[PDB]
Design an enzyme around this catalytic site. Structure first.
Site, PDB file in Angstrom:
ATOM      1  N   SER A   2       0.660  -1.296  -0.055  1.00  0.00           N
ATOM      2  CA  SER A   2       0.207   0.009  -0.117  1.00  0.00           C
ATOM      3  C   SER A   2       0.758   1.245  -0.076  1.00  0.00           C
ATOM      4  CB  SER A   2      -1.036   0.075   1.250  1.00  0.00           C
ATOM      5  OG  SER A   2      -1.967   1.068   1.029  1.00  0.00           O
ATOM      6  N   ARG A   3       0.519   2.235  -1.024  1.00  0.00           N
ATOM      7  CA  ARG A   3       1.594   3.290  -1.280  1.00  0.00           C
ATOM      8  C   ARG A   3       1.154   4.501  -0.212  1.00  0.00           C
ATOM      9  NH1 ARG A   3       2.589   1.090  -6.278  1.00  0.00           N
ATOM     10  NH2 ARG A   3       1.001   2.065  -7.816  1.00  0.00           N
TER      11      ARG A   3
END
Ligand code: ATP
Ligand code: MG
Lengths: 47, 53, 62, 501
Positions: free
Chosen positions: D365-366
């Site tokens: 997850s960025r």
């Protein structure tokens, strides 16, 4: 690009068959000794 | 609401009244008997064990 | 509003129908067959108990 | 009834109008070639004489290629196509919550009609660069693995990718069910109005799904759009935008929404059919050149408005299906380079018993540290590092012995954490319970406990915490951090419980 699990058998290459070979030794010999032991057991139970 | 939607003649209030009349069987204390256990256990610990100890 | 003859046409077909509503006009026995099938299926979904009383239980204690 | 039929007849619109019109030249495969309609806007809703709809998609110089919204069995060369002048739009509002609507916002639930007041287009633009504000709040999915290792903030696109039957829809539905605790509570800054777009699924699957949602009483805040397998290609190509507009209403109305596309690889197939039949040039895998613009302009509506535009939000969890872990195919890479993360699911993990079968190695997850609560942040940082360390040497697992006690410790910790991440189905957990469990896991209060029993412990512990120390959990939840007092209290509870079992 990645790999998987249990894939040395799917390729069917040299290792894919040597593995069957190794497993079949082990379990043929185990089946032989187990059959002998089961015989022994039932024959003893004749008494 | 049922009587409203339920056009049935009287079955609505029929069952209403009957329901309201019906009463559930409450279960009755029957396991509730081993109490002397406590007391007799009390004896084993408080009489049969208190004085010996 | 009565200017459109369509409204009056529908309205008085409707009326004649309501007057005929002494029974469901032109029901047709296939109507009854559909009723039969779906009423059963509904009942089985609702069970087999007589749909008239308070089915007694006489609940069981431990 | 009859008396009702009276006003049913009266409540009509008999008026007529002077409308434009063109006549069908051709038809077949679901694509009319209307001739005329000289003043028809591109991507507009025309109506055929029989009663169908169509979306005048391909304005060629001499004819307009319209795509029928249904079987064209009812259309014939010669029929009349009358334009409506209005781009495709759909109903919106809070009247939809609890209903089931089709791609065009028509209740397919029986259950009465939709009482929506305000409609809304489907081809709006995403909010610009200024309206958005960084992703900060978390979206508790209720799944340990998702919620601790691969977090999901509100306003973030998080692909849910994986092969067939690995549990993607299950993750989405656990996410939908988890929001019940917020949506029953008080605060309006934590209420998520889930949406679920069902594309290409068969009506039996959507029926079972709405049954699951109703059982958990999770429909009172969910919309369920549905363009199922039998609905003509345009209604599958168009459902995601109907869902995204229903969600954009909430987003720009200062509310928080969440939209789940399932799948987004059965919308691209429908669009491919539409294009190939319209004769547009094909591309790789036969997809047109718009199969990126298609998705991108959809998944770029999932924003997190700032506090001047309302403060709303719209998450997005596009479910994608990959053919045997071929993440390099066209659509998987098209939709992996648009979104802010990915929750990879695998079958080797699903059948090893690690359910949900999330593959923390590939899942990222960025947003990362943000989109977590300080408590979950404290726990999950150490958990993530420990799991990475375990993964990098898990290859030795089959030997274990004959190796240094340090790697033996690493394996004995990684196995415990892996067993803790295993979760049931439709059993999401509040964040405080997740924090308690993973705290008992990462601080070593299980290393001496055989792996086979960890699951047992977990459940027991929850039962021993929820029914006993709700005050501590409330203390953790109201302020999402572990104050030293809370830390020590958790340590005491974990230790004494483990002693008592
Ligand atoms: N956490 C879990 N624990 C146990 N079983 C699970 C879990 N999650 C999913 N499953 C199982 O996985 C199966 C498939 O679930 P699901 O439909 O969510 O996957 P899917 O990828 O959406 O399927 P499809 O791709 O065919 O639509 C279900 O039968 C379910 O029993
Ligand atoms: Mg699914």
């Amino acid at each position: 690009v990645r790999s998987s699990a249990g894939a040395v058998r799917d390729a069917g290459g040299a290792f894919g068959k040597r593995e069957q070979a190794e497993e079949e030794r082990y379990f043929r010999a185990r089946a032989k000794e187990q059959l002998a032991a089961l015989k022994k057991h039932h024959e003893n139970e004749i008494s | 609401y049922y009587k409203a939607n339920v056009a049935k003649a009287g079955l609505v209030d029929d069952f209403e009244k009957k329901f309201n009349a019906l009463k559930v069987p409450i279960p009755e204390d029957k396991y509730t008997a081993q109490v002397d256990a406590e007391e007799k256990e009390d004896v084993k610990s408080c009489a049969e064990f208190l004085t010996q100890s | 509003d009565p200017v459109q003859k369509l409204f009056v046409d529908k309205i008085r077909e409707y009326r004649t129908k309501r007057q005929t509503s002494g029974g469901p006009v032109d029901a047709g026995p296939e109507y009854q067959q559909d009723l039969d099938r779906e009423l059963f299926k509904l009942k089985q979904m609702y069970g087999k108990a007589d749909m008239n009383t308070f089915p007694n239980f006489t609940f069981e204690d431990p | 009834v009859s008396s009702i039929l009276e006003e049913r007849i009266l409540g009509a619109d008999t008026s007529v109008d002077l409308e434009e019109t063109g006549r069908v030249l051709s038809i077949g495969d679901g694509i009319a070639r209307v001739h005329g309609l000289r003043n028809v806007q591109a991507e507009e809703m025309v109506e055929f004489s029989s009663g169908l709809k169509g979306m005048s998609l391909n304005l060629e110089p001499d004819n307009v290629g319209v795509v029928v919204f249904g079987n064209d069995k009812l259309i014939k060369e010669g029929d009349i196509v009358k334009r409506t002048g209005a781009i495709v739009d759909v109903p919106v509002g809070e009247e939809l919550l609890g209903r089931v609507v089709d791609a065009l916002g028509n209740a397919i639930d029986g259950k009465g009609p939709i009482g929506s007041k305000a409609r809304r287009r489907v081809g709006l633009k995403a909010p610009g660069i200024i309206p958005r504000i960084s992703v900060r709040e978390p979206m508790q999915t209720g799944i340990k693995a998702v919620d601790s290792l691969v977090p999901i903030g509100r306003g973030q696109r998080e692909l849910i990718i994986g092969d067939r039957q690995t549990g993607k829809t299950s993750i989405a539905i656990d996410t939908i069910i988890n929001q019940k605790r917020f949506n029953d509570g008080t605060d309006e800054k934590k209420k998520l109005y889930c949406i679920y777009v069902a594309i290409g699924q068969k009506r039996s699957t959507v029926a079972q799904l709405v049954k699951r949602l109703t059982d958990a009483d999770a429909m009172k805040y969910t919309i369920v759009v549905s363009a199922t397998a039998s609905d003509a290609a345009p209604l599958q190509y168009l459902a995601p935008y109907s869902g995204c507009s229903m969600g954009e209403y909430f987003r720009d109305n200062g509310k928080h929404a969440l939209i789940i596309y399932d799948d987004l690889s059965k919308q691209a197939v429908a669009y491919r059919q539409m294009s190939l039949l319209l004769r547009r040039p094909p591309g790789r895998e036969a997809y047109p050149g718009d199969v990126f613009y298609l998705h991108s302009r959809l998944l770029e509506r999932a924003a997190k408005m700032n506090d001047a535009f309302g403060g709303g939000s719209l998450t997005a969890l596009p479910v994608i299906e990959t053919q045997a872990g071929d993440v390099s195919a066209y659509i998987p890479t098209n939709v992996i380079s648009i979104t802010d993360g990915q929750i990879f699911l695998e079958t080797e993990l699903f059948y090893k018993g690690i359910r949900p079968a999330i593959n923390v190695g590939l899942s990222v997850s960025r947003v990362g540290s943000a989109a977590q609560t300080r408590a979950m942040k404290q726990v999950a940082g150490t958990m993530k590092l420990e799991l990475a360390q375990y993964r990098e040497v898990a290859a030795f697992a089959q030997f274990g012995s004959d190796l240094d006690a340090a790697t033996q410790q690493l394996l004995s910790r990684g196995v415990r954490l892996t067993e803790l991440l295993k979760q049931g189905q439709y059993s999401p957990m509040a964040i405080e319970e997740q924090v308690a469990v993973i705290y008992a896991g990462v601080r070593g209060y299980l290393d001496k406990l055989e792996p086979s029993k960890i699951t047992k412990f977990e459940n027991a512990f929850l039962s021993h915490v929820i029914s006993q120390h709700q005050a501590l959990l409330g203390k953790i939840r109201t302020d999402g951090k572990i104050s030293e007092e809370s830390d020590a209290k958790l340590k005491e509870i974990v230790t004494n419980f483990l002693a008592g079992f």
